[PDB]
JSON list of C-alpha atoms and ligand atoms in Angstrom, two decimals:
[
{"chain": "A", "resi": 2, "resn": "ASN", "atom": "CA", "xyz": [82.17, 122.68, 73.63]},
{"chain": "A", "resi": 3, "resn": "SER", "atom": "CA", "xyz": [81.70, 118.99, 73.02]},
{"chain": "A", "resi": 4, "resn": "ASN", "atom": "CA", "xyz": [79.47, 117.18, 75.59]},
{"chain": "A", "resi": 5, "resn": "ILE", "atom": "CA", "xyz": [81.59, 113.98, 75.62]},
{"chain": "A", "resi": 6, "resn": "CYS", "atom": "CA", "xyz": [85.24, 113.40, 76.67]},
{"chain": "A", "resi": 7, "resn": "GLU", "atom": "CA", "xyz": [87.53, 113.51, 73.67]},
{"chain": "A", "resi": 8, "resn": "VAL", "atom": "CA", "xyz": [89.55, 110.51, 74.91]},
{"chain": "A", "resi": 9, "resn": "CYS", "atom": "CA", "xyz": [86.92, 108.01, 76.14]},
{"chain": "A", "resi": 10, "resn": "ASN", "atom": "CA", "xyz": [83.80, 109.34, 74.39]},
{"chain": "A", "resi": 11, "resn": "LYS", "atom": "CA", "xyz": [81.71, 109.30, 77.62]},
{"chain": "A", "resi": 12, "resn": "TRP", "atom": "CA", "xyz": [79.77, 112.10, 79.30]},
{"chain": "A", "resi": 13, "resn": "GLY", "atom": "CA", "xyz": [80.48, 112.84, 82.95]},
{"chain": "A", "resi": 14, "resn": "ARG", "atom": "CA", "xyz": [82.27, 115.62, 84.90]},
{"chain": "A", "resi": 15, "resn": "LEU", "atom": "CA", "xyz": [84.02, 117.32, 81.91]},
{"chain": "A", "resi": 16, "resn": "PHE", "atom": "CA", "xyz": [86.53, 120.22, 81.78]},
{"chain": "A", "resi": 17, "resn": "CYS", "atom": "CA", "xyz": [86.17, 122.33, 78.67]},
{"chain": "A", "resi": 18, "resn": "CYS", "atom": "CA", "xyz": [89.02, 123.74, 76.58]},
{"chain": "A", "resi": 19, "resn": "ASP", "atom": "CA", "xyz": [88.96, 127.56, 76.22]},
{"chain": "A", "resi": 20, "resn": "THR", "atom": "CA", "xyz": [90.60, 127.64, 72.81]},
{"chain": "A", "resi": 21, "resn": "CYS", "atom": "CA", "xyz": [88.91, 124.74, 71.06]},
{"chain": "A", "resi": 22, "resn": "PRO", "atom": "CA", "xyz": [85.61, 122.83, 71.45]},
{"chain": "A", "resi": 23, "resn": "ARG", "atom": "CA", "xyz": [87.07, 119.68, 73.07]},
{"chain": "A", "resi": 24, "resn": "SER", "atom": "CA", "xyz": [86.25, 118.46, 76.55]},
{"chain": "A", "resi": 25, "resn": "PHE", "atom": "CA", "xyz": [87.90, 116.02, 78.98]},
{"chain": "A", "resi": 26, "resn": "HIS", "atom": "CA", "xyz": [87.48, 114.06, 82.09]},
{"chain": "A", "resi": 27, "resn": "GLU", "atom": "CA", "xyz": [90.02, 115.16, 84.65]},
{"chain": "A", "resi": 28, "resn": "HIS", "atom": "CA", "xyz": [92.20, 112.02, 84.41]},
{"chain": "A", "resi": 29, "resn": "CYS", "atom": "CA", "xyz": [91.60, 111.33, 80.74]},
{"chain": "A", "resi": 30, "resn": "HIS", "atom": "CA", "xyz": [93.52, 114.50, 79.81]},
{"chain": "A", "resi": 31, "resn": "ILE", "atom": "CA", "xyz": [97.27, 114.18, 80.03]},
{"chain": "A", "resi": 32, "resn": "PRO", "atom": "CA", "xyz": [98.58, 115.88, 82.02]},
{"chain": "A", "resi": 33, "resn": "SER", "atom": "CA", "xyz": [95.51, 115.63, 84.42]},
{"chain": "A", "resi": 34, "resn": "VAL", "atom": "CA", "xyz": [93.39, 118.81, 84.00]},
{"chain": "A", "resi": 35, "resn": "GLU", "atom": "CA", "xyz": [95.05, 121.64, 85.91]},
{"chain": "A", "resi": 36, "resn": "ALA", "atom": "CA", "xyz": [93.36, 122.96, 89.17]},
{"chain": "A", "resi": 37, "resn": "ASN", "atom": "CA", "xyz": [93.09, 126.62, 88.16]},
{"chain": "A", "resi": 38, "resn": "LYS", "atom": "CA", "xyz": [94.40, 128.34, 84.91]},
{"chain": "A", "resi": 39, "resn": "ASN", "atom": "CA", "xyz": [91.69, 130.54, 83.33]},
{"chain": "A", "resi": 40, "resn": "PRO", "atom": "CA", "xyz": [91.69, 130.37, 80.43]},
{"chain": "A", "resi": 41, "resn": "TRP", "atom": "CA", "xyz": [92.74, 126.71, 80.00]},
{"chain": "A", "resi": 42, "resn": "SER", "atom": "CA", "xyz": [94.08, 125.23, 76.83]},
{"chain": "A", "resi": 43, "resn": "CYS", "atom": "CA", "xyz": [94.11, 121.43, 76.24]},
{"chain": "A", "resi": 44, "resn": "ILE", "atom": "CA", "xyz": [97.03, 119.43, 74.96]},
{"chain": "A", "resi": 45, "resn": "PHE", "atom": "CA", "xyz": [95.68, 119.49, 71.38]},
{"chain": "A", "resi": 46, "resn": "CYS", "atom": "CA", "xyz": [95.88, 123.30, 71.50]},
{"chain": "A", "resi": 47, "resn": "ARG", "atom": "CA", "xyz": [99.30, 123.35, 73.21]},
{"chain": "A", "resi": 48, "resn": "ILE", "atom": "CA", "xyz": [100.71, 121.06, 70.51]},
{"chain": "A", "resi": 49, "resn": "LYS", "atom": "CA", "xyz": [99.20, 123.18, 67.70]},
{"chain": "A", "resi": 50, "resn": "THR", "atom": "CA", "xyz": [100.86, 126.30, 69.26]},
{"chain": "A", "resi": 51, "resn": "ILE", "atom": "CA", "xyz": [104.31, 124.62, 69.22]},
{"chain": "A", "resi": 52, "resn": "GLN", "atom": "CA", "xyz": [103.86, 123.91, 65.51]},
{"chain": "A", "resi": 53, "resn": "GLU", "atom": "CA", "xyz": [102.63, 127.45, 64.77]},
{"chain": "A", "resi": 54, "resn": "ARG", "atom": "CA", "xyz": [105.53, 129.07, 66.59]},
{"chain": "A", "resi": 55, "resn": "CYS", "atom": "CA", "xyz": [108.10, 126.91, 64.70]},
{"chain": "A", "resi": 56, "resn": "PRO", "atom": "CA", "xyz": [106.66, 125.88, 61.32]},
{"chain": "A", "resi": 57, "resn": "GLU", "atom": "CA", "xyz": [109.99, 124.22, 60.42]},
{"chain": "A", "resi": 58, "resn": "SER", "atom": "CA", "xyz": [109.33, 121.74, 63.27]},
{"chain": "A", "resi": 59, "resn": "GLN", "atom": "CA", "xyz": [107.10, 119.93, 60.71]},
{"chain": "A", "resi": 60, "resn": "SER", "atom": "CA", "xyz": [109.97, 119.20, 58.30]},
{"chain": "A", "resi": 61, "resn": "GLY", "atom": "CA", "xyz": [110.98, 115.57, 58.26]},
{"chain": "A", "resi": 62, "resn": "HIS", "atom": "CA", "xyz": [113.16, 114.06, 60.99]},
{"chain": "A", "resi": 63, "resn": "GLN", "atom": "CA", "xyz": [115.15, 110.86, 61.41]},
{"chain": "A", "resi": 64, "resn": "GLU", "atom": "CA", "xyz": [113.76, 108.59, 64.19]},
{"chain": "A", "resi": 65, "resn": "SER", "atom": "CA", "xyz": [117.23, 108.08, 65.60]},
{"chain": "A", "resi": 66, "resn": "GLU", "atom": "CA", "xyz": [117.66, 111.84, 66.19]},
{"chain": "A", "resi": 67, "resn": "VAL", "atom": "CA", "xyz": [114.17, 112.12, 67.73]},
{"chain": "A", "resi": 68, "resn": "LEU", "atom": "CA", "xyz": [114.87, 109.31, 70.18]},
{"chain": "A", "resi": 69, "resn": "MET", "atom": "CA", "xyz": [118.08, 110.88, 71.54]},
{"chain": "A", "resi": 70, "resn": "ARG", "atom": "CA", "xyz": [116.34, 114.13, 72.37]},
{"chain": "A", "resi": 71, "resn": "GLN", "atom": "CA", "xyz": [116.37, 115.09, 75.99]},
{"chain": "A", "resi": 72, "resn": "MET", "atom": "CA", "xyz": [112.93, 115.38, 77.62]},
{"chain": "A", "resi": 73, "resn": "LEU", "atom": "CA", "xyz": [112.77, 119.22, 77.78]},
{"chain": "A", "resi": 74, "resn": "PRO", "atom": "CA", "xyz": [109.27, 120.76, 78.16]},
{"chain": "A", "resi": 75, "resn": "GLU", "atom": "CA", "xyz": [108.35, 120.49, 74.49]},
{"chain": "A", "resi": 76, "resn": "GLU", "atom": "CA", "xyz": [109.40, 116.82, 74.15]},
{"chain": "A", "resi": 77, "resn": "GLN", "atom": "CA", "xyz": [107.63, 116.02, 77.44]},
{"chain": "A", "resi": 78, "resn": "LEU", "atom": "CA", "xyz": [104.43, 117.54, 76.03]},
{"chain": "A", "resi": 79, "resn": "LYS", "atom": "CA", "xyz": [104.80, 115.65, 72.77]},
{"chain": "A", "resi": 80, "resn": "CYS", "atom": "CA", "xyz": [105.16, 112.30, 74.56]},
{"chain": "A", "resi": 81, "resn": "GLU", "atom": "CA", "xyz": [102.12, 113.18, 76.80]},
{"chain": "A", "resi": 82, "resn": "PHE", "atom": "CA", "xyz": [100.10, 113.84, 73.64]},
{"chain": "A", "resi": 83, "resn": "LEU", "atom": "CA", "xyz": [101.27, 110.65, 71.97]},
{"chain": "A", "resi": 84, "resn": "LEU", "atom": "CA", "xyz": [100.27, 108.69, 75.12]},
{"chain": "A", "resi": 85, "resn": "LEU", "atom": "CA", "xyz": [96.92, 110.41, 74.97]},
{"chain": "A", "resi": 86, "resn": "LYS", "atom": "CA", "xyz": [96.36, 109.47, 71.35]},
{"chain": "A", "resi": 87, "resn": "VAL", "atom": "CA", "xyz": [96.80, 105.79, 72.36]},
{"chain": "A", "resi": 88, "resn": "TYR", "atom": "CA", "xyz": [94.25, 106.09, 75.16]},
{"chain": "A", "resi": 89, "resn": "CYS", "atom": "CA", "xyz": [91.90, 107.65, 72.60]},
{"chain": "A", "resi": 90, "resn": "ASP", "atom": "CA", "xyz": [91.49, 104.20, 70.98]},
{"chain": "A", "resi": 91, "resn": "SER", "atom": "CA", "xyz": [89.03, 101.97, 72.81]},
{"chain": "A", "resi": 92, "resn": "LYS", "atom": "CA", "xyz": [91.38, 98.97, 72.40]},
{"chain": "A", "resi": 93, "resn": "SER", "atom": "CA", "xyz": [93.78, 100.69, 74.77]},
{"chain": "A", "resi": 94, "resn": "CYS", "atom": "CA", "xyz": [91.70, 99.20, 77.65]},
{"chain": "A", "resi": 95, "resn": "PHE", "atom": "CA", "xyz": [93.58, 95.94, 77.15]},
{"chain": "A", "resi": 96, "resn": "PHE", "atom": "CA", "xyz": [96.92, 97.59, 77.85]},
{"chain": "A", "resi": 97, "resn": "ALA", "atom": "CA", "xyz": [95.98, 100.17, 80.50]},
{"chain": "A", "resi": 98, "resn": "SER", "atom": "CA", "xyz": [96.29, 98.34, 83.76]},
{"chain": "A", "resi": 99, "resn": "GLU", "atom": "CA", "xyz": [98.86, 95.88, 85.13]},
{"chain": "A", "resi": 100, "resn": "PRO", "atom": "CA", "xyz": [98.64, 92.57, 83.32]},
{"chain": "A", "resi": 101, "resn": "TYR", "atom": "CA", "xyz": [99.11, 89.00, 84.66]},
{"chain": "A", "resi": 102, "resn": "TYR", "atom": "CA", "xyz": [100.25, 85.94, 82.82]},
{"chain": "A", "resi": 103, "resn": "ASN", "atom": "CA", "xyz": [98.93, 82.38, 83.31]},
{"chain": "A", "resi": 104, "resn": "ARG", "atom": "CA", "xyz": [98.41, 80.60, 80.05]},
{"chain": "A", "resi": 105, "resn": "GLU", "atom": "CA", "xyz": [99.36, 76.99, 79.30]},
{"chain": "A", "resi": 106, "resn": "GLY", "atom": "CA", "xyz": [102.29, 76.99, 76.92]},
{"chain": "A", "resi": 107, "resn": "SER", "atom": "CA", "xyz": [103.48, 80.55, 77.58]},
{"chain": "A", "resi": 108, "resn": "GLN", "atom": "CA", "xyz": [105.70, 82.26, 80.06]},
{"chain": "A", "resi": 109, "resn": "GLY", "atom": "CA", "xyz": [105.12, 85.90, 81.11]},
{"chain": "A", "resi": 110, "resn": "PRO", "atom": "CA", "xyz": [107.47, 88.67, 80.03]},
{"chain": "A", "resi": 111, "resn": "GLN", "atom": "CA", "xyz": [110.63, 89.50, 81.94]},
{"chain": "A", "resi": 112, "resn": "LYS", "atom": "CA", "xyz": [109.64, 93.17, 82.05]},
{"chain": "A", "resi": 113, "resn": "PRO", "atom": "CA", "xyz": [105.94, 93.76, 82.18]},
{"chain": "A", "resi": 114, "resn": "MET", "atom": "CA", "xyz": [104.68, 97.20, 81.03]},
{"chain": "A", "resi": 115, "resn": "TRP", "atom": "CA", "xyz": [101.30, 98.94, 80.72]},
{"chain": "A", "resi": 116, "resn": "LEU", "atom": "CA", "xyz": [99.87, 102.36, 79.80]},
{"chain": "A", "resi": 117, "resn": "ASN", "atom": "CA", "xyz": [99.18, 103.52, 83.33]},
{"chain": "A", "resi": 118, "resn": "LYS", "atom": "CA", "xyz": [102.75, 102.77, 84.36]},
{"chain": "A", "resi": 119, "resn": "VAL", "atom": "CA", "xyz": [103.99, 104.89, 81.45]},
{"chain": "A", "resi": 120, "resn": "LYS", "atom": "CA", "xyz": [101.54, 107.59, 82.46]},
{"chain": "A", "resi": 121, "resn": "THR", "atom": "CA", "xyz": [102.93, 107.61, 86.01]},
{"chain": "A", "resi": 122, "resn": "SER", "atom": "CA", "xyz": [106.48, 107.55, 84.67]},
{"chain": "A", "resi": 123, "resn": "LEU", "atom": "CA", "xyz": [105.82, 110.64, 82.59]},
{"chain": "A", "resi": 124, "resn": "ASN", "atom": "CA", "xyz": [104.07, 112.39, 85.42]},
{"chain": "A", "resi": 125, "resn": "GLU", "atom": "CA", "xyz": [106.99, 111.78, 87.77]},
{"chain": "A", "resi": 126, "resn": "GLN", "atom": "CA", "xyz": [109.57, 112.88, 85.07]},
{"chain": "A", "resi": 127, "resn": "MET", "atom": "CA", "xyz": [111.30, 109.53, 85.06]},
{"chain": "A", "resi": 128, "resn": "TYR", "atom": "CA", "xyz": [112.27, 109.64, 81.39]},
{"chain": "A", "resi": 129, "resn": "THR", "atom": "CA", "xyz": [115.35, 111.73, 80.49]},
{"chain": "A", "resi": 130, "resn": "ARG", "atom": "CA", "xyz": [115.09, 111.10, 76.74]},
{"chain": "A", "resi": 131, "resn": "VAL", "atom": "CA", "xyz": [112.32, 110.43, 74.23]},
{"chain": "A", "resi": 132, "resn": "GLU", "atom": "CA", "xyz": [113.94, 106.99, 73.75]},
{"chain": "A", "resi": 133, "resn": "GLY", "atom": "CA", "xyz": [112.91, 105.98, 77.33]},
{"chain": "A", "resi": 134, "resn": "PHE", "atom": "CA", "xyz": [109.25, 106.64, 76.65]},
{"chain": "A", "resi": 135, "resn": "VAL", "atom": "CA", "xyz": [109.18, 105.07, 73.17]},
{"chain": "A", "resi": 136, "resn": "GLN", "atom": "CA", "xyz": [110.99, 101.97, 74.44]},
{"chain": "A", "resi": 137, "resn": "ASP", "atom": "CA", "xyz": [108.42, 101.35, 77.22]},
{"chain": "A", "resi": 138, "resn": "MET", "atom": "CA", "xyz": [105.56, 101.98, 74.79]},
{"chain": "A", "resi": 139, "resn": "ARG", "atom": "CA", "xyz": [106.83, 99.50, 72.19]},
{"chain": "A", "resi": 140, "resn": "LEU", "atom": "CA", "xyz": [107.53, 97.02, 75.02]},
{"chain": "A", "resi": 141, "resn": "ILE", "atom": "CA", "xyz": [103.83, 96.87, 75.88]},
{"chain": "A", "resi": 142, "resn": "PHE", "atom": "CA", "xyz": [103.00, 95.59, 72.40]},
{"chain": "A", "resi": 143, "resn": "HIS", "atom": "CA", "xyz": [106.07, 93.38, 72.06]},
{"chain": "A", "resi": 144, "resn": "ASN", "atom": "CA", "xyz": [105.27, 91.62, 75.36]},
{"chain": "A", "resi": 145, "resn": "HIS", "atom": "CA", "xyz": [101.71, 91.03, 74.19]},
{"chain": "A", "resi": 146, "resn": "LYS", "atom": "CA", "xyz": [102.74, 89.54, 70.85]},
{"chain": "A", "resi": 147, "resn": "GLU", "atom": "CA", "xyz": [105.21, 87.23, 72.48]},
{"chain": "A", "resi": 148, "resn": "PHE", "atom": "CA", "xyz": [102.85, 85.98, 75.19]},
{"chain": "A", "resi": 149, "resn": "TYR", "atom": "CA", "xyz": [99.78, 85.37, 73.06]},
{"chain": "A", "resi": 150, "resn": "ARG", "atom": "CA", "xyz": [101.75, 83.56, 70.31]},
{"chain": "A", "resi": 151, "resn": "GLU", "atom": "CA", "xyz": [99.25, 82.20, 67.78]},
{"chain": "A", "resi": 152, "resn": "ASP", "atom": "CA", "xyz": [96.07, 83.08, 69.62]},
{"chain": "A", "resi": 153, "resn": "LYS", "atom": "CA", "xyz": [94.15, 85.54, 67.53]},
{"chain": "A", "resi": 154, "resn": "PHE", "atom": "CA", "xyz": [94.24, 87.93, 70.52]},
{"chain": "A", "resi": 155, "resn": "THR", "atom": "CA", "xyz": [97.77, 88.85, 69.46]},
{"chain": "A", "resi": 156, "resn": "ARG", "atom": "CA", "xyz": [96.09, 91.06, 66.88]},
{"chain": "A", "resi": 157, "resn": "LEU", "atom": "CA", "xyz": [95.02, 93.56, 69.52]},
{"chain": "A", "resi": 158, "resn": "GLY", "atom": "CA", "xyz": [98.69, 94.34, 70.10]},
{"chain": "A", "resi": 159, "resn": "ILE", "atom": "CA", "xyz": [99.33, 94.80, 66.40]},
{"chain": "A", "resi": 160, "resn": "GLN", "atom": "CA", "xyz": [96.33, 97.11, 66.19]},
{"chain": "A", "resi": 161, "resn": "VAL", "atom": "CA", "xyz": [97.22, 99.37, 69.10]},
{"chain": "A", "resi": 162, "resn": "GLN", "atom": "CA", "xyz": [100.91, 99.39, 68.12]},
{"chain": "A", "resi": 163, "resn": "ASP", "atom": "CA", "xyz": [99.80, 100.68, 64.69]},
{"chain": "A", "resi": 164, "resn": "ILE", "atom": "CA", "xyz": [97.97, 103.58, 66.37]},
{"chain": "A", "resi": 165, "resn": "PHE", "atom": "CA", "xyz": [101.04, 104.35, 68.46]},
{"chain": "A", "resi": 166, "resn": "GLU", "atom": "CA", "xyz": [103.43, 104.28, 65.51]},
{"chain": "A", "resi": 167, "resn": "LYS", "atom": "CA", "xyz": [101.22, 106.41, 63.17]},
{"chain": "A", "resi": 168, "resn": "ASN", "atom": "CA", "xyz": [100.85, 109.02, 65.91]},
{"chain": "A", "resi": 169, "resn": "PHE", "atom": "CA", "xyz": [104.59, 108.89, 66.70]},
{"chain": "A", "resi": 170, "resn": "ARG", "atom": "CA", "xyz": [105.42, 109.60, 63.02]},
{"chain": "A", "resi": 171, "resn": "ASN", "atom": "CA", "xyz": [102.89, 112.50, 62.95]},
{"chain": "A", "resi": 172, "resn": "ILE", "atom": "CA", "xyz": [103.70, 114.16, 66.31]},
{"chain": "A", "resi": 173, "resn": "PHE", "atom": "CA", "xyz": [107.43, 114.01, 65.88]},
{"chain": "A", "resi": 174, "resn": "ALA", "atom": "CA", "xyz": [107.32, 114.73, 62.14]},
{"chain": "A", "resi": 175, "resn": "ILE", "atom": "CA", "xyz": [109.30, 111.66, 61.15]},
{"chain": "A", "resi": 176, "resn": "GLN", "atom": "CA", "xyz": [110.44, 111.84, 57.50]},
{"chain": "A", "resi": 177, "resn": "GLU", "atom": "CA", "xyz": [107.97, 110.01, 55.23]},
{"chain": "A", "resi": 178, "resn": "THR", "atom": "CA", "xyz": [109.32, 106.88, 53.48]},
{"chain": "A", "resi": 179, "resn": "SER", "atom": "CA", "xyz": [108.22, 104.05, 51.15]},
{"chain": "B", "resi": 201, "resn": "ZN", "atom": "ZN1", "xyz": [87.17, 110.46, 79.45]},
{"chain": "B", "resi": 202, "resn": "ZN", "atom": "ZN1", "xyz": [91.88, 122.75, 73.03]},
{"chain": "B", "resi": 203, "resn": "ZN", "atom": "ZN1", "xyz": [110.78, 128.94, 64.17]}
]
Protein backbone atom coordinates (compact mmCIF):
# COMPACT_ATOMS: atom_id res chain seq x y z
CA ASN A 1 0.00 0.00 0.00
CA SER A 2 0.85 3.65 -0.40
CA ASN A 3 2.51 5.28 2.67
CA ILE A 4 0.67 8.62 2.28
CA CYS A 5 -3.08 9.44 2.44
CA GLU A 6 -4.60 9.52 -1.02
CA VAL A 7 -6.65 12.65 -0.21
CA CYS A 8 -4.23 14.94 1.66
CA ASN A 9 -0.88 13.41 0.67
CA LYS A 10 0.38 13.28 4.31
CA TRP A 11 1.68 10.34 6.32
CA GLY A 12 0.07 9.63 9.69
CA ARG A 13 -2.31 6.96 11.09
CA LEU A 14 -3.41 5.41 7.73
CA PHE A 15 -6.00 2.69 6.93
CA CYS A 16 -5.06 0.58 3.95
CA CYS A 17 -7.41 -0.60 1.21
CA ASP A 18 -7.52 -4.41 0.78
CA THR A 19 -8.30 -4.36 -2.92
CA CYS A 20 -6.06 -1.57 -4.15
CA PRO A 21 -2.83 0.10 -2.94
CA ARG A 22 -4.41 3.34 -1.63
CA SER A 23 -4.37 4.47 1.97
CA PHE A 24 -6.39 7.00 3.99
CA HIS A 25 -6.59 8.90 7.16
CA GLU A 26 -9.73 7.96 9.02
CA HIS A 27 -11.58 11.24 8.34
CA CYS A 28 -10.08 11.93 4.94
CA HIS A 29 -11.92 8.91 3.51
CA ILE A 30 -15.59 9.48 2.84
CA PRO A 31 -17.45 7.86 4.41
CA SER A 32 -15.02 7.88 7.48
CA VAL A 33 -13.08 4.56 7.50
CA GLU A 34 -15.33 1.84 8.90
CA ALA A 35 -14.56 0.38 12.43
CA ASN A 36 -14.30 -3.29 11.42
CA LYS A 37 -14.91 -4.88 7.91
CA ASN A 38 -12.05 -7.25 6.97
CA PRO A 39 -11.36 -7.06 4.16
CA TRP A 40 -12.03 -3.33 3.58
CA SER A 41 -12.47 -1.74 0.22
CA CYS A 42 -12.11 2.06 -0.27
CA ILE A 43 -14.50 4.27 -2.16
CA PHE A 44 -12.35 4.14 -5.31
CA CYS A 45 -12.81 0.35 -5.34
CA ARG A 46 -16.54 0.53 -4.49
CA ILE A 47 -17.11 2.94 -7.39
CA LYS A 48 -15.13 0.74 -9.82
CA THR A 49 -17.31 -2.27 -8.76
CA ILE A 50 -20.53 -0.35 -9.59
CA GLN A 51 -19.17 0.35 -13.06
CA GLU A 52 -18.03 -3.26 -13.58
CA ARG A 53 -21.38 -4.69 -12.53
CA CYS A 54 -23.28 -2.34 -14.93
CA PRO A 55 -21.01 -1.38 -17.84
CA GLU A 56 -23.91 0.51 -19.47
CA SER A 57 -23.79 2.92 -16.48
CA GLN A 58 -20.90 4.58 -18.39
CA SER A 59 -23.06 5.53 -21.40
CA GLY A 60 -23.78 9.23 -21.59
CA HIS A 61 -26.45 10.86 -19.41
CA GLN A 62 -28.26 14.19 -19.40
CA GLU A 63 -27.43 16.33 -16.32
CA SER A 64 -31.09 17.08 -15.76
CA GLU A 65 -31.90 13.36 -15.38
CA VAL A 66 -28.91 12.81 -13.06
CA LEU A 67 -29.98 15.65 -10.78
CA MET A 68 -33.52 14.30 -10.26
CA ARG A 69 -32.25 10.93 -9.12
CA GLN A 70 -33.20 9.94 -5.64
CA MET A 71 -30.27 9.40 -3.24
CA LEU A 72 -30.41 5.56 -3.15
CA PRO A 73 -27.21 3.78 -1.98
CA GLU A 74 -25.43 4.01 -5.32
CA GLU A 75 -26.12 7.75 -5.81
CA GLN A 76 -25.14 8.39 -2.18
CA LEU A 77 -21.80 6.66 -2.83
CA LYS A 78 -21.26 8.61 -6.04
CA CYS A 79 -21.81 11.96 -4.30
CA GLU A 80 -19.46 10.85 -1.43
CA PHE A 81 -16.79 10.07 -4.03
CA LEU A 82 -17.31 13.35 -5.85
CA LEU A 83 -16.97 15.21 -2.51
CA LEU A 84 -13.80 13.26 -1.90
CA LYS A 85 -12.33 14.19 -5.27
CA VAL A 86 -12.76 17.88 -4.30
CA TYR A 87 -10.98 17.38 -0.99
CA CYS A 88 -8.19 15.68 -2.95
CA ASP A 89 -7.18 19.10 -4.34
CA SER A 90 -5.08 21.14 -1.93
CA LYS A 91 -7.06 24.30 -2.81
CA SER A 92 -10.06 22.74 -1.12
CA CYS A 93 -8.64 24.05 2.20
CA PHE A 94 -10.13 27.45 1.35
CA PHE A 95 -13.64 26.02 1.21
CA ALA A 96 -13.53 23.37 3.94
CA SER A 97 -14.49 25.19 7.08
CA GLU A 98 -17.14 27.81 7.85
CA PRO A 99 -16.27 31.11 6.23
CA TYR A 100 -16.81 34.69 7.50
CA TYR A 101 -17.27 37.84 5.52
CA ASN A 102 -15.88 41.29 6.40
CA ARG A 103 -14.48 43.06 3.40
CA GLU A 104 -14.98 46.73 2.53
CA GLY A 105 -17.26 46.96 -0.48
CA SER A 106 -18.80 43.48 -0.20
CA GLN A 107 -21.66 41.91 1.63
CA GLY A 108 -21.58 38.24 2.71
CA PRO A 109 -23.79 35.64 1.04
CA GLN A 110 -27.36 35.03 2.12
CA LYS A 111 -26.67 31.29 2.38
CA PRO A 112 -23.15 30.44 3.36
CA MET A 113 -21.89 26.94 2.47
CA TRP A 114 -18.66 24.96 2.92
CA LEU A 115 -17.28 21.46 2.29
CA ASN A 116 -17.52 20.23 5.85
CA LYS A 117 -21.18 21.22 6.02
CA VAL A 118 -21.83 19.21 2.84
CA LYS A 119 -19.87 16.34 4.35
CA THR A 120 -22.07 16.39 7.46
CA SER A 121 -25.18 16.71 5.32
CA LEU A 122 -24.26 13.60 3.38
CA ASN A 123 -23.35 11.71 6.50
CA GLU A 124 -26.70 12.50 8.11
CA GLN A 125 -28.62 11.60 4.84
CA MET A 126 -30.08 15.06 4.51
CA TYR A 127 -30.15 15.05 0.71
CA THR A 128 -33.06 13.19 -0.94
CA ARG A 129 -31.87 13.83 -4.51
CA VAL A 130 -28.55 14.33 -6.27
CA GLU A 131 -29.77 17.88 -7.03
CA GLY A 132 -29.56 18.78 -3.29
CA PHE A 133 -25.90 17.87 -3.11
CA VAL A 134 -24.90 19.46 -6.43
CA GLN A 135 -26.74 22.67 -5.54
CA ASP A 136 -24.88 23.08 -2.23
CA MET A 137 -21.58 22.27 -3.92
CA ARG A 138 -22.02 24.86 -6.68
CA LEU A 139 -23.21 27.36 -4.04
CA ILE A 140 -19.82 27.24 -2.33
CA PHE A 141 -18.10 28.49 -5.48
CA HIS A 142 -20.84 30.91 -6.49
CA ASN A 143 -20.74 32.59 -3.05
CA HIS A 144 -16.98 32.93 -3.33
CA LYS A 145 -17.08 34.51 -6.78
CA GLU A 146 -19.70 36.99 -5.73
CA PHE A 147 -17.98 38.05 -2.50
CA TYR A 148 -14.46 38.45 -3.83
CA ARG A 149 -15.59 40.42 -6.92
CA GLU A 150 -12.48 41.62 -8.76
CA ASP A 151 -9.89 40.50 -6.24
CA LYS A 152 -7.70 37.93 -7.87
CA PHE A 153 -8.66 35.53 -5.05
CA THR A 154 -11.88 34.87 -6.94
CA ARG A 155 -9.79 32.57 -9.10
CA LEU A 156 -9.55 29.98 -6.34
CA GLY A 157 -13.29 29.45 -6.66
CA ILE A 158 -13.06 29.06 -10.42
CA GLN A 159 -10.26 26.55 -9.96
CA VAL A 160 -11.96 24.34 -7.41
CA GLN A 161 -15.31 24.58 -9.24
CA ASP A 162 -13.50 23.25 -12.33
CA ILE A 163 -12.32 20.21 -10.34
CA PHE A 164 -15.84 19.64 -9.06
CA GLU A 165 -17.45 19.90 -12.48
CA LYS A 166 -14.89 17.64 -14.29
CA ASN A 167 -15.35 14.99 -11.60
CA PHE A 168 -19.17 15.38 -11.71
CA ARG A 169 -19.14 14.76 -15.50
CA ASN A 170 -16.86 11.69 -15.04
CA ILE A 171 -18.55 10.06 -12.02
CA PHE A 172 -22.06 10.47 -13.31
CA ALA A 173 -21.11 9.78 -16.94
CA ILE A 174 -22.59 12.98 -18.29
CA GLN A 175 -22.83 12.91 -22.11
CA GLU A 176 -19.78 14.58 -23.68
CA THR A 177 -20.46 17.81 -25.63
CA SER A 178 -18.66 20.58 -27.56
ZN1 LIG B 1 -5.43 12.49 4.76
ZN1 LIG C 1 -9.27 0.61 -2.90
ZN1 LIG D 1 -25.88 -4.17 -16.12
